[PDB]
């Protein structure tokens, strides 16, 4: 789809969903922290994304009316794994999508923040960040040491919380 | 023998004659796709653009 053109007006519409559609809650994460939790997302969720996404290939064009019991599927496993996020592990993402907001949304700018964020969601939500489609001789860029990219600016807060972190023994 | 080698020369212009009535009628005989437009690549059923790929579009 093509981004509206010379004249456009958004409108709402104020219709209520069919009740006879079960009623689903919504992902309430802005751009940023869901960015943040997207791998953890991925980790968890993707037997129910697969099956979404078969399921709408598989309708051949009817996808949205006929996929929606496994949208409610994947919405779910969604939010439950952001409010395991909110419940253990809240400080370093919002370290870390604080970090992106100042970053242009860029990973690599957000590299001391991740770590923690990383070791945190492993160690008490037993969720494993990786990048799909590798050899083993190519390295993830995540877990690179001295990169050639780098933020202009090293994060303040995440400077102090690494450091401190690496003092204690958890990073 | 006259009557014989006219006969003769009779049969095969009637051979020459069905074998036009037969090319005239193969000509318009209607060909396969693979022999008509494409041999190797045979299905005429397109794949579109690869780069966004939505679950969904593909319908038969």
Same mark, same amino acid.
């Given at each position: 789809?093509?981004?509206?053109?010379?004249?456009?007006?958004?409108?709402?519409?104020?219709?209520?969903?069919?009740?006879?559609?079960?009623?689903?809650?919504?992902?309430?994460?802005?751009?940023?922290?869901?960015?943040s939790?997207?791998?953890?997302?991925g980790?968890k #969720?993707?037997?129910?994304?697969?099956?979404?996404?078969?399921?709408?290939?598989?309708?051949?064009?009817?996808?949205a /009316?006929? #996929?929606? !019991?496994?949208?409610?599927?994947? %919405?779910?496993?969604?939010?439950?794994?952001?409010?395991? /996020?909110?419940?253990? #592990?809240?400080?370093?993402?919002?370290?870390?999508?604080?970090?992106?907001?100042?970053?242009?949304?860029?990973?690599?700018?957000?590299? !001391?923040?991740?770590?923690?964020?990383?070791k945190?969601?492993? %160690?008490?939500?037993?969720?494993?960040? !990786?990048?799909?489609?590798?050899?083993?001789?190519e390295?993830?860029?995540?877990?690179?040491?001295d990169?050639?990219?780098?933020?202009?600016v090293?994060?303040? !807060?995440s400077?102090?919380?690494?450091?401190?972190?690496?003092?204690?023994?958890?990073? | @023998?006259?009557?014989?080698?006219?006969?003769?020369?009779?049969?095969?212009?009637?051979?020459?004659?069905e074998?036009?009535?037969?090319?005239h009628?193969?000509?318009?005989?209607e060909? @396969?796709?693979?022999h008509?437009?494409?041999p190797?690549?045979?299905?005429?059923?397109?794949?579109?653009?690869?780069?966004?790929?939505?679950?969904?579009?593909?319908?038969?």
């Open positions: 789809p093509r981004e509206a053109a010379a004249h456009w007006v958004p409108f709402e519409d104020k219709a209520n969903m069919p009740d006879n559609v079960p009623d689903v809650v919504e992902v309430g994460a802005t751009s940023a922290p869901l960015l939790a997207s791998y953890f997302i980790a #969720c993707k037997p129910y994304n697969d099956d979404f996404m078969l399921c709408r290939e598989e309708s051949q064009g009817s996808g /009316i006929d #996929c929606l !019991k496994e949208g409610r599927r994947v %919405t779910r496993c969604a939010v439950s794994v952001i409010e395991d /996020i909110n419940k253990s #592990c809240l400080d370093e993402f919002r370290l870390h999508w604080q970090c992106l907001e100042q970053n242009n949304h860029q990973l690599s700018g957000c590299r !001391k923040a991740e770590a923690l964020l990383n945190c969601v492993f %160690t008490k939500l037993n969720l494993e960040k !990786k990048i799909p489609g590798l050899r083993p001789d390295e993830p860029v995540f877990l690179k040491k990169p050639w990219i780098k933020p202009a090293d994060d303040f !807060k400077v102090r919380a690494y450091a401190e972190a690496k003092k204690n023994g958890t990073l | @023998d006259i009557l014989n080698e006219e006969a003769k020369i009779v049969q095969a212009l009637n051979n020459q004659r074998l036009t009535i037969k090319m009628e193969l000509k318009r005989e060909k @396969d796709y693979a008509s437009y494409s190797l690549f045979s299905d005429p059923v397109p794949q579109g653009g690869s780069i966004g790929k939505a679950p969904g579009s593909s319908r038969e």
